[PDB]
Amino acid sequence: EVKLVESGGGLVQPGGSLRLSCAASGSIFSINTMGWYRQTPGKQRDLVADISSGGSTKYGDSVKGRFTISRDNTKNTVYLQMNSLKPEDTAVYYCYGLSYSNDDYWGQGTQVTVS
Amino acid sequence: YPPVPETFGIQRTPKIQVYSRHPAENGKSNFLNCYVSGFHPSDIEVDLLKNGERIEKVEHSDLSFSKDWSFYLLYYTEFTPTEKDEYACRVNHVTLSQPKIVKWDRGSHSMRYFSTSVSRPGRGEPRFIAVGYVDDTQFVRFDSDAASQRMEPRAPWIEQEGPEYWDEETGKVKAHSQTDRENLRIALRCYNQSEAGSHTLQMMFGCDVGSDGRFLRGYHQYAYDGKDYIALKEDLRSWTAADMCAQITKRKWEAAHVAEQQRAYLEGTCVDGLRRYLENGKETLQRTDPPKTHMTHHPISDHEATLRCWALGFYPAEITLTWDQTQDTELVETRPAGDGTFQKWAAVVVPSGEEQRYTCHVQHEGLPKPLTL
């Protein structure tokens, strides 16, 4: 149905910057909202940033102003520019998409580590 | 506001209901509701979805909790459904590995004060939220994170009160938030818990009166991390202590004669204040909205068929719906419509062809006689 290919991440020191990208494979108009949740040390994952096909975005409060999300609808690809990274930003970042019927799809995650 | 004279000496996943206020008609304005209830702790992220994206402007009710200390919230917004639009509710909670998505499928009187203090180490002082209720109608609120920093009206009939009322209530709910903040540090030390963890302290206070308005029952109880801590017994003379930490609080509150102070306030000021509110909001609080009842018959296969007994627009929330087999009936929790009334329904799967043999029993105080349909 829908496949989400994640890339990016890596290992950086505090104050450094990192990028993320996620592409959707399948139907051209299959996916509306795309974005990232990140795994907390506990059980749940928290919203980092997402964006709809129209450009409406939302950021988690802890990453507002530091992280910036962008999107290319022609490639069904979202990008996340992370700046001013802190140790608490270290987590597995899951890409996710929402079908126009409110079905959720999830990538396997990408590791980000800050000292 | 309740006195609170002295200081001290787990995880539930949310139940999600997404529904419209009125029956959905294409092209007719309505209200999309997402009622989350029965969860602990309180922190929760709720989103309304339309055609695969978030609905940006969404309002929610003030944080409150049920008798079992589990929290409930109502997220709602105006909308007009069409044939093509698909709506869903997304809920994130510590009990969920990923946010859960639920799609949209087309007498006596009491006063209560509820309070919730949630610590947030590293992120400043704990969040304190207090709400007041008369029966099933909320009338005041206080949010320590709000810009007003005042007790705010939440019912039309409480706006009558003068400035001295709001000055008195604000100062008392502020003093309570400081007391419960110190209580959170006491419970942390007594249980030998880490300072980096987040904890919850809930309190309940209020009185019951009968039809004649005379005193009936009084209450004052605490909860820590969703578990009972200390509770004033029915005789309003002694306390119920859950653990050894609360037993220290019990002995301290006993020497200070706290129970005697709470008993006088419950039988006095609480009843006097509840009697005043019931009068000023007579047309609201002393009304009885009867349920608008109807039944639906839609088969799920050729073997079985589903019968749903609906009850809409009733107040107060207390109601009973029965078809007697209790193991074969799905009973959703009573949910608010968002306009002061409540909703509920009962379902049962039934072998096709035996529909005319089943009946729904409707019980509500707004009905002179219990209905059978």
Author numbering:
A (entry chain B): 3 to 117
B (entry chain A): 1 to 9, 25 to 121, 144 to 360, 366 to 415
Authors' own words:
Using our ARTEMIS platform for determination of HLA-restricted peptides, we determined a length-specific peptide logo for HLA-A*24:02 computed from 1,883 8-mer peptides. We found, along with the canonical binding mode (p2 occupying the B-pocket), an alternative binding mode for 8-mer peptides where position p1 echoed the amino acid preference of the B-pocket. To confirm this, we expressed an ARTEMIS-identified self-peptide from the RADX protein, YPPVPETF, in an A*24:02 SCTY84C/A139C background. The 2.5 Å resolution structure, with two complexes in the AU, showed clear electron density in the groove confirming that this 8-mer peptide bound leaving the A-pocket empty, with p1 (tyrosine) filling the B-pocket. Residues at p2, p4, p5/6, and p8, bound in the D, C, E, and F-pockets, respectively, recapitulating the canonical binding mode for an A24 8-mer peptide save for residues P5 and P6, which extend slightly out of the groove, each partially filling the E-pocket and taking up slack for the shifted register. Our reported structural studies using this approach showed overall conservation of native peptide recognition by SCTs across most examples analyzed, with the important caveat that long peptides could adopt multiple or non-canonical binding modes due to register shifts in less-constrained SCTs. These studies also reconfirmed non-canonical binding by a subset of 8-mer peptides, an important consideration for TCR recognition.
